[PDB]
Amino acid sequence: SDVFHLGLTKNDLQGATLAIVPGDPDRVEKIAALMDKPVKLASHREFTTWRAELDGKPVIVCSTGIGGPSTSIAVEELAQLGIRTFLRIGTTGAIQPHINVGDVLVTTASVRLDGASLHFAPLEFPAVADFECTTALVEAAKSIGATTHVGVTASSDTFYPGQERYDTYSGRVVRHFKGSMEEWQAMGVMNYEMESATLLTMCASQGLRAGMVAGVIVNRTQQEIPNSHAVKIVVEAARRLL
Amino acid sequence: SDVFHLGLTKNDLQGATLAIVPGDPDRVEKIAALMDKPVKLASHREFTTWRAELDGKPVIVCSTGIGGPSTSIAVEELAQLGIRTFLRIGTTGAIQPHINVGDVLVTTASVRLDGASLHFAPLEFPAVADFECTTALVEAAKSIGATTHVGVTASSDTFYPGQERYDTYSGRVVRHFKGSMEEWQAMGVMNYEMESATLLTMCASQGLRAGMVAGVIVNRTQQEIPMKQTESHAVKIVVEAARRLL
Amino acid sequence: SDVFHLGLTKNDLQGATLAIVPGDPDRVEKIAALMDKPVKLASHREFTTWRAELDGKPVIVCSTGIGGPSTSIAVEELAQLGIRTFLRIGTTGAIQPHINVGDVLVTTASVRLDGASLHFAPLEFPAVADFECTTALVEAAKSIGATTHVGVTASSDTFYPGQERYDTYSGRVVRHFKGSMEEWQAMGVMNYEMESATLLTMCASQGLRAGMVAGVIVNRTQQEIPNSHAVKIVVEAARRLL
Amino acid sequence: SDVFHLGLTKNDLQGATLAIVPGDPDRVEKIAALMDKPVKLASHREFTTWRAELDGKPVIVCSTGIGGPSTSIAVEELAQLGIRTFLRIGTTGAIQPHINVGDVLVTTASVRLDGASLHFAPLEFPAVADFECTTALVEAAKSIGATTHVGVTASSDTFYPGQERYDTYSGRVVRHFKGSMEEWQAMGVMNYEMESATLLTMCASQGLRAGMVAGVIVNRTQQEIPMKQTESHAVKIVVEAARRLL
Amino acid sequence: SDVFHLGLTKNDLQGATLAIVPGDPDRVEKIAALMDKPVKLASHREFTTWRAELDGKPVIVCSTGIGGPSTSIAVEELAQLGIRTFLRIGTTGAIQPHINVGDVLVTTASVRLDGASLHFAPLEFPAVADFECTTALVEAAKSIGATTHVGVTASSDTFYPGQERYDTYSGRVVRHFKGSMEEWQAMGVMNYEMESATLLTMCASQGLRAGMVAGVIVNRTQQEIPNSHAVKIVVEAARRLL
Amino acid sequence: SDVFHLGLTKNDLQGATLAIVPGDPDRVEKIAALMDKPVKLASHREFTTWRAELDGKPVIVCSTGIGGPSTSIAVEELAQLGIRTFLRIGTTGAIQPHINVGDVLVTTASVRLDGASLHFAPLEFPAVADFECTTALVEAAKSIGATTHVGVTASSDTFYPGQERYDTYSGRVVRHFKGSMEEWQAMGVMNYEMESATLLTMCASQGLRAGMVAGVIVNRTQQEIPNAETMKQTESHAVKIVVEAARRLL
Numbered sequence A, C, E: 001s002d003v004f005h006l007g008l009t010k011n012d013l014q015g016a017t018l019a020i021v022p023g024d025p026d027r028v029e030k031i032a033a034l035m036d037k038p039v040k041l042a043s044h045r046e047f048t049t050w051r052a053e054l055d056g057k058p059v060i061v062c063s064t065g066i067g068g069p070s071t072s073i074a075v076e077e078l079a080q081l082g083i084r085t086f087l088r089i090g091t092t093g094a095i096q097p098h099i100n101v102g103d104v105l106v107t108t109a110s111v112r113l114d115g116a117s118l119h120f121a122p123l124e125f126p127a128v129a130d131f132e133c134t135t136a137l138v139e140a141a142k143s144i145g146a147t148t149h150v151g152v153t154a155s156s157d158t159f160y161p162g163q164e165r166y167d168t169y170s171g172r173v174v175r176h177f178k179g180s181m182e183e184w185q186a187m188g189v190m191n192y193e194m195e196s197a198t199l200l201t202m203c204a205s206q207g208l209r210a211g212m213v214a215g216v217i218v219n220r221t222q223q224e225i226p227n228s229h230a231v232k233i234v235v236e237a238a239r240r241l242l
Numbered sequence B, D: 001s002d003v004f005h006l007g008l009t010k011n012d013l014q015g016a017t018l019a020i021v022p023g024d025p026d027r028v029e030k031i032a033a034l035m036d037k038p039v040k041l042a043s044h045r046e047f048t049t050w051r052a053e054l055d056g057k058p059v060i061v062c063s064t065g066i067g068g069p070s071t072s073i074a075v076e077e078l079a080q081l082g083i084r085t086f087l088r089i090g091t092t093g094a095i096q097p098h099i100n101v102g103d104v105l106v107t108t109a110s111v112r113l114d115g116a117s118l119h120f121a122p123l124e125f126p127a128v129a130d131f132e133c134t135t136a137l138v139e140a141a142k143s144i145g146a147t148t149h150v151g152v153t154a155s156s157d158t159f160y161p162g163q164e165r166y167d168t169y170s171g172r173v174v175r176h177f178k179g180s181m182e183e184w185q186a187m188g189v190m191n192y193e194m195e196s197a198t199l200l201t202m203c204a205s206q207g208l209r210a211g212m213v214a215g216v217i218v219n220r221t222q223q224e225i226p227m228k229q230t231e232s233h234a235v236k237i238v239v240e241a242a243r244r245l246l
Numbered sequence F: 001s002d003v004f005h006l007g008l009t010k011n012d013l014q015g016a017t018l019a020i021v022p023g024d025p026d027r028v029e030k031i032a033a034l035m036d037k038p039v040k041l042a043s044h045r046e047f048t049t050w051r052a053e054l055d056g057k058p059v060i061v062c063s064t065g066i067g068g069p070s071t072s073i074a075v076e077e078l079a080q081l082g083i084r085t086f087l088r089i090g091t092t093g094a095i096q097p098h099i100n101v102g103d104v105l106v107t108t109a110s111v112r113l114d115g116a117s118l119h120f121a122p123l124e125f126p127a128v129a130d131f132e133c134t135t136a137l138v139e140a141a142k143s144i145g146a147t148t149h150v151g152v153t154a155s156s157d158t159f160y161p162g163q164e165r166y167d168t169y170s171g172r173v174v175r176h177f178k179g180s181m182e183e184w185q186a187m188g189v190m191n192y193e194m195e196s197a198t199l200l201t202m203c204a205s206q207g208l209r210a211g212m213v214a215g216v217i218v219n220r221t222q223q224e225i226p227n228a229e230t231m232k233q234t235e236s237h238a239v240k241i242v243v244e245a246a247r248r249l250l
């Protein structure tokens, strides 16, 4: 193996330069299966890698696990192997009252509520998505007719306090995040998730193209805890970026 | 007058909701003149405002002056009068050796090296341009055939130390900014300018649409201190983008 | 022209080493006219420059525009031309209930709510005025008998949120500045304006002398939006600093 | 299921209040197997959970995945199910030349180079391990005779730049971390790993007991990129400490 | 004299490598007097130094004065003289309702609300006590049967605002610390004092062993202003560390 | 006693509203003895307090010890007992080559390299002296004849690494302060000391008047440790100035 964590070699990728990067290892095979000649390559820790073919070109599907840190490992090591384009596909909680469960959200840029992004660029640097990737994602969503929102995402190193959840062991939120959800809504932020800030920052600051799309599984103006269109979209976007 | 600085009334705008915002008051009339029925509205401090017409729709052209603070006054007060879309047109100096004088830069988001943006959103919030504005700008540029770069801009509160210029009175740069250009360079940042961080942050965090386009007048990989046809390209592009956003 | 923005040459200055720097280009000629042999030198963007003579010495009057960034340009380029002493004359909003519209405020040092000052010295460095300049201004005010307050000024990169104005398009103020006016008042801060923090920091940290005086045009304990003694004072101070 | 990520119920735990939290799901079963009556409970994402028994008391073994964020999910949700003591077992790379591959490191507190800990307590709050857990870990180490170091650990959100690795795609490290390893080295810091800052801070600030132990697999004073008997030592140590904290 | 402030020579120490460091100069002799052959060595500014003998080994008692800054001088200069182990003995205000006046508090690590610690290590570095020292203190306290709490301490550069006291000349507390005591209680912090952050950080980051114990003189859930078990404990702990 | 640390009552002050505040408890009596009717009030920890009379008015002299934190206690407690003007008197080491041993420094404001000032106002607030105090100090200096420098002082919570000293147990300086002395020098900072940032910030933000003067006893840019005797005399010079300044502020 050529990389320390993923257990992959340059050769396993077979010239692939695009990766769809879901968070959950168990959803890797599922995404791969929507393409041609899906093949499992490796599985170590939270990193599960499949290779498939899309319009006759090799494409990687590799899971990041939850969070900036493991994402930063996946992305670095895939880049070493030759990946230049990363499409992230996630689940997310919407924080605006007009976004519905099942809606698709495309992130133009992220509020950096993470630690890992600071390891690539200082805070003033925008966690901005690649324009071609964003365009591909928006356009893909248009063509499958999914209801889509485009805008800014709050990207948090935690699922609980950083997203201002109060149903927790302690029931408290640190001073810094008390009242934070409401500030982000006032600023038009669409949703919370946990990886985009890292992904976008590490890519934007290293010449790698990244885009970001998520399916809404809960609306935070209703509920803290949650009770496929996006997967179709990310694959179709990959198709346009090949 | 309905606003404190611009010396304009809601009426003067005639239902305009889009503004082209150059930095220089003297450049305002030139831009308005590319459109129909250009009329001077007002001129106070660095804020010169003309109204014109584009495919029969009223459009504002308004100068920001240099820097976030004055930009923030013009944007706020325009927003009060009904503007909802802001297209910035500028000059800039590239910091990438592949970008040439004459090229056009469309900013997706900015490195926030300014003070005003912090007055609208904390630092972690992205100084990101509106997707539709960026699209219109990129498409306008394609349509007139300019060689174009799309990416990140470093937006500084100073022309000198914040852009790591050493050829100054003191000849020196504060510790924080020493070696900073080389860092932005490695991170793929295209250029320095002085207003976008404020503009993009204040718009993105208040439901206002903003976009940024600039023509390259100098390249820092050869010179610190700094062609008329280059800003003619950029102006043409911004006006054409306005057309698509109406 | 010897400088990139002001369109002036060393020669235009005629040995001048002192500049009165108002914010508004339209008030430059007005100030120059209080001195002898006033002459327009240049006008570019927000930078309008006149030269005049005071007790037989050449003096510059040059506008900064609104805000640290354009101020930093004017001051840098005037320094390059040989100016060593900067007197700022502005308009301001008082935030103490006992300071009246028409009162003259002399800044000893500023609360740095700007970005540009950080490009000259880190935050811990005081935005302090020069002692000779402050003395001149205080003494000038005494001799024309204007009612004067001497003390600390909050210098803000914005006119709206940074000065906690709520009559705005959005009607909100970012968390950081919510309740900030009241903190500054409790701390004895006299007023808000937008340039001193930049001016004072850039000069104090480069061996340039700077002083700062403003006429109060609104009292913020009453109003957000506003409805010449100071000009006389700045000129008279210049006279003592020659 | 009672918790959103782990896929467990309060019942599955059978009154367990202590959890051993390795990073790697694949290591969970190995650890459980050193105890009595090991049973797989659940496996979702990077979270694999086994239950076992230690001196007749139920004990949880549950993987965190790599990094503070997923760690914080595991710990929060385990806390919701009744766990009050967390023992982390890891692999690490030492940055002191006197610490050898094979040595065991017990962390008293961590340099907080992570994002998640800030979600529980501001930066000035110490990422400090629980005194009893640290004592149990040190005593367990002594009892099996491993050569042990007790001290401060640097806990980074990245494996690469945050640990000042240059042998990467870009070959560069952000200004903030340039020269950082030499600083931690001078300050007596033993090693880099990626979870403890989050773990220790979130437990220390919520009345939960946490401890940290790792086996040294590589030494940075010779190599960036990286024996089976070393982690066998550390695992033996963590289980024995668990025994003493029951 | 070998050091700039303490007026001591290597030789005065007679091979001592452990120092008990109280805050108050007047309490130095008192502590020394609990050991054998107590001898006054020096007295300059807030730094009073006695030497005594404990189980036939020389031991220093040296006062730090109040606050990180003077502490940092004492510790640095003692270290130059050969001290490698520092045991702090202080008075403190408890902020948990269950901790009583007279109780003994052993600090595992401190919330760094001081300035001096940042001069040794950046804020992300833990103000953690040495494990052997903490063990010695805890065990000492067990053996003399004093009622003891072990945990985190908030260490503040001020006695008034940084500990959220309101009975002051001004009666205000700066925004940053408004509501701070309650946050620290929620987080399990036991108490306020003023030196541990500096001591623990400067020691932990230079290979010096440090421990921290204090007797509770006020409970802040009742009172702002206050109306020997700890001294016995620090001495006994020194004994175990020799 | 009316205050927790100083062991003073409002009555002890006899209506005093000005205090001279040196660093060292042992210099308090010496300063007070320059004035009339000097009397010891109290002595607890590093806080020694004498009262004297200047042109018929009662005046306090009170030591702060070293550093923001204790200064903060003394100023607060003095303020509660009715003090409204604080004059800091010290000795210091210059970092500018033109400033000589023997010179006198009046500080207009300080670089805040301390912790305690943040407990009073956020970092952006200037650690600035009161204008009347600074004027009185500069004018006192001019009247007794000192060669005076007026400007910015760097106020540090440590004597060693924060002042960039490498002659230490560890011989190293934290990243933040590495190369910092050269930066302050380039920015015209006159000297380092250890209390002004706290004092000036806590006063300027609470309607208290503060000022500071110091004699130069050493210069970091030259070699040349002067002398025990030249240090004693420079110190007397500066004390003479603060007292004379106190006169003008009464």
Ligand SMILES: O=c1ccn([C@H]2C[C@H](O)[C@@H](CO)O2)c(=O)[nH]1
Residues within 6 Å of the ligand: A023, A065, A066, A067, A090, A091, A092, A093, A094, A159, A163, A192, A193, A194, A195, A217, A218
């Ligand atoms: O409300 C929600 C729903 C989903 N996620 C994300 C991204 C992360 O990997 C994982 C946590 O459930 O899914 C959230 O952060 N918040």
Ligand SMILES: O=c1ccn([C@H]2C[C@H](O)[C@@H](CO)O2)c(=O)[nH]1
Residues within 6 Å of the ligand: B023, B065, B066, B067, B090, B091, B092, B093, B159, B163, B192, B193, B194, B195, B218
């Ligand atoms: O190198 C350059 C060229 C242009 N500008 C910008 C934006 C600002 O208003 C003005 C200064 O020349 O133009 C720069 O900042 N840097």
Ligand SMILES: O=c1ccn([C@H]2C[C@H](O)[C@@H](CO)O2)c(=O)[nH]1
Residues within 6 Å of the ligand: C023, C065, C066, C067, C090, C091, C092, C093, C094, C159, C163, C192, C193, C194, C195, C217, C218
């Ligand atoms: O309340 C007020 C009145 C005036 N100004 C200032 C300085 C700036 O250039 C311009 C904006 O009105 O005037 C303020 O900041 N606040």
Ligand SMILES: O=c1ccn([C@H]2C[C@H](O)[C@@H](CO)O2)c(=O)[nH]1
Residues within 6 Å of the ligand: D023, D065, D066, D067, D090, D091, D092, D093, D094, D159, D163, D192, D193, D194, D195, D217, D218
């Ligand atoms: O040099 C090393 C060796 C191991 N780890 C850790 C903790 C993290 O979960 C995972 C990454 O390899 O192992 C490091 O961070 N750095």
Ligand SMILES: O=c1ccn([C@H]2C[C@H](O)[C@@H](CO)O2)c(=O)[nH]1
Residues within 6 Å of the ligand: E023, E065, E066, E067, E090, E091, E092, E093, E094, E159, E163, E192, E193, E194, E195, E217, E218
């Ligand atoms: O509530 C209290 C009681 C005592 N001390 C401390 C430590 C410092 O040296 C001195 C100041 O009173 O005593 C406090 O900080 N807070």
Ligand SMILES: [K+]
Residues within 6 Å of the ligand: A046, A064, A065, A066, A067, A070, D046, D064, D065, D066, D067, D070
């Ligand atoms: K993970």
Ligand SMILES: [K+]
Residues within 6 Å of the ligand: B046, B064, B065, B066, B067, B070, C046, C064, C065, C066, C067, C070
């Ligand atoms: K301007």
Ligand SMILES: [K+]
Residues within 6 Å of the ligand: E046, E064, E065, E066, E067, E070, F046, F064, F065, F066, F067, F070
């Ligand atoms: K002290």
